[PDB]
Design an enzyme around this catalytic site. Sequence first.
Site, PDB file in Angstrom:
ATOM      1  N   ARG A   1      10.596  53.901  38.395  1.00 13.43           N
ATOM      2  CA  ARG A   1      11.059  52.716  37.683  1.00 13.43           C
ATOM      3  C   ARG A   1      11.261  51.532  38.619  1.00 13.43           C
ATOM      4  O   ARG A   1      10.932  50.396  38.279  1.00 13.43           O
ATOM      5  CB  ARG A   1      12.370  53.012  36.945  1.00 13.43           C
ATOM      6  CG  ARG A   1      12.249  54.082  35.878  1.00 13.43           C
ATOM      7  CD  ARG A   1      13.501  54.155  35.022  1.00 13.43           C
ATOM      8  NE  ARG A   1      13.381  55.175  33.986  1.00 13.43           N
ATOM      9  CZ  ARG A   1      14.204  55.285  32.949  1.00 13.43           C
ATOM     10  NH1 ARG A   1      15.210  54.434  32.810  1.00 13.43           N
ATOM     11  NH2 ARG A   1      14.018  56.243  32.052  1.00 13.43           N
TER      12      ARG A   1
ATOM     13  N   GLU B   1      17.846  53.186  25.136  1.00 12.14           N
ATOM     14  CA  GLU B   1      18.801  52.087  25.117  1.00 12.14           C
ATOM     15  C   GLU B   1      19.801  52.264  23.966  1.00 12.14           C
ATOM     16  O   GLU B   1      21.012  52.155  24.155  1.00 12.14           O
ATOM     17  CB  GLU B   1      18.031  50.778  24.941  1.00 12.14           C
ATOM     18  CG  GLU B   1      18.836  49.520  25.103  1.00 12.14           C
ATOM     19  CD  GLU B   1      17.995  48.283  24.848  1.00 12.14           C
ATOM     20  OE1 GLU B   1      16.862  48.217  25.375  1.00 12.14           O
ATOM     21  OE2 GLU B   1      18.465  47.381  24.127  1.00 12.14           O
TER      22      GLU B   1
ATOM     23  N   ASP C   1      25.282  41.631  40.472  1.00 11.26           N
ATOM     24  CA  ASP C   1      24.071  41.075  41.078  1.00 11.26           C
ATOM     25  C   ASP C   1      24.155  39.570  41.300  1.00 11.26           C
ATOM     26  O   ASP C   1      23.388  39.014  42.085  1.00 11.26           O
ATOM     27  CB  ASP C   1      22.835  41.389  40.226  1.00 11.26           C
ATOM     28  CG  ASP C   1      22.463  42.862  40.244  1.00 11.26           C
ATOM     29  OD1 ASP C   1      23.024  43.617  41.064  1.00 11.26           O
ATOM     30  OD2 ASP C   1      21.593  43.260  39.435  1.00 11.26           O
TER      31      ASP C   1
END
Length: 182
Positions: free
Chosen positions: A118, A164, A35
């Site tokens: 999401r 997670e 990104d």
Amino acid sequence: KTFIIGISGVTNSGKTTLAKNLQKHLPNCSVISQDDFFKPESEIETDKNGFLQYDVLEALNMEKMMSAISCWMESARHSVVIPILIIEGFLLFNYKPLDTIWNRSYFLTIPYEECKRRRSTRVYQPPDSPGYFDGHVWPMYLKYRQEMQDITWEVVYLDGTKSEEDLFLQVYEDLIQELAKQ
Ligand SMILES: NC(=O)c1ccc[n+]([C@@H]2O[C@H](COP(=O)(O)O)[C@@H](O)[C@H]2O)c1
């Protein structure tokens, strides 16, 4: 001498968090995020329907990312008097120049419904235009998975709807076995 891990997957699936959690538990480990190599909005093209083309390799300066990877490689040589690099991003496994760099590859998946939900809770810059998910994001993701049908190396697919900690433990358990085989 080095061990390079690739973490790709659908958009907004916990890729950066997984990379960071792995890094906190691995010595001499660095993380490069795809990104950070997106071109500025002014350089992004638009399709026939006016949608910004962000979910294709053309939206990223991959040459700059390769330079960043090469820089890590040089640094790794001097980090010991095994260096680990985790490269994470939504569009890594269809980039041919890096097809042989991966020592282990993981891919986070989330079904359409949940992925869309999401994505809406997240804010990008520029922000998603109305109907951006169905008009560009998902179609491009399907194109990516289609391109991966002819992938030339092994990929471990993960359930991104897991917690997670669950994902971290699963991947860490696999990674340590792979490091051992090296
Ligand atoms: N990084 C930026 O500057 C930027 C700008 C516009 C849209 N996006 C979106 O970011 C997504 C990929 O990043 P994630 O895998 O973190 O969700 C893409 O699906 C793309 O549509 C990123």
